[PDB]
Amino acid sequence: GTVNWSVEDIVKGINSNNLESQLQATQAARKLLSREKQPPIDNIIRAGLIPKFVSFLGKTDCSPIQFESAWALTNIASGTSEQTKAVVDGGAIPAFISLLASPHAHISEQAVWALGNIAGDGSAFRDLVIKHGAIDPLLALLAVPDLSTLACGYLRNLTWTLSNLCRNKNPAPPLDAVEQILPTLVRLLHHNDPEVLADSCWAISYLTDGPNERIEMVVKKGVVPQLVKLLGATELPIVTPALRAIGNIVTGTDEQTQKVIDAGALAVFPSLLTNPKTNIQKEATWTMSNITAGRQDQIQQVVNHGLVPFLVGVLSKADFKTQKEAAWAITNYTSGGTVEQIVYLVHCGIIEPLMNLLSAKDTKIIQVILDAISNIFQAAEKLGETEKLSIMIEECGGLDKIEALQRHENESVYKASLNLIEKYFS
């Protein structure tokens, strides 16, 4: 019936002054735009249909054409920035915000989705969606005693759109918008649907990806224990944003870092640092590196939780970008650690896999590693035990490596090698 129309036929019907012909043509547009293989978005745009669709959003008298045009506009807005811009340029934002109040769930849901696509384009349209007042009617859709009474697909769309209002970083979303959204995000973080949980975690990971004051607004909401719990989820789509969020939080202050430690996060890192998903291992190890950049009592928690052997393991075998985060984790550890903490690191076997990574081509990890060795020697000096570390480093081929880097394109590698050699190998 409305399957496989031409754009010309769609235009013919939409330009009729027959609401029912317009409705059928709009549905035909929507089915065209709904196909997975090359939906003719630009042809639809070029035909001048967006303003018509937008005006159909206002036809309260004809809810099906509201839905069809909402769906059509959603899929145009799902495209490139220029395609999303065409939807915004047609005045769709306030019209979609008005549809949030529709008594038809499938129509307000489509409007939720469309606003999510628009906000998802970037911070400019995100903030424009906010300026048009989308947040209050979005949150009002979630103002029910129990989220479980809402349709699951409906709740997932709302969560996803809310997460796009939290997304993107220059600028980050307006502070008052974040504060307005955060109590609903906290609630969604306790809902029992894995996709709502994943998208709530994504939203929190965006909100915590910024300066310490952004992290603080989230941490002050009390969500870190829940994040840590989600960190133990079996669903990778939940663990990944939950870990990004936890990792972001530990980029903040020592006090914000302490709250993820207090919440039990370190007990999950044996799994995370051996996780089969390399991106999880990289994130977990990056997170570990920022925890070992903390206080000695925080380094001590890493020790107590048995995590140094896991860092030795990741240094020993992991994809290179994880090994580099492990190298950073070690250098941070050796920079802030006590002497006995640094000794324990050597006792756990850090030296050999550290030396093996001096053969890496990446010259930054070499600086990281030589800095760590320097700090370990500095602790060995405080114990009179510089020689047996020199032997240890020599016995595994590390002296060969420090001698190699003696000649190296980079001046900072260059210098740290010979200084280590002249001071500890003579």
Partner: peptide, 9 residues
């Protein structure tokens, strides 16, 4: 408020 912290690379 801790210069040793690193953002993602």
């Amino acid at each position: 408020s801790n210069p040793r912290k690193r953002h993602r690379e």
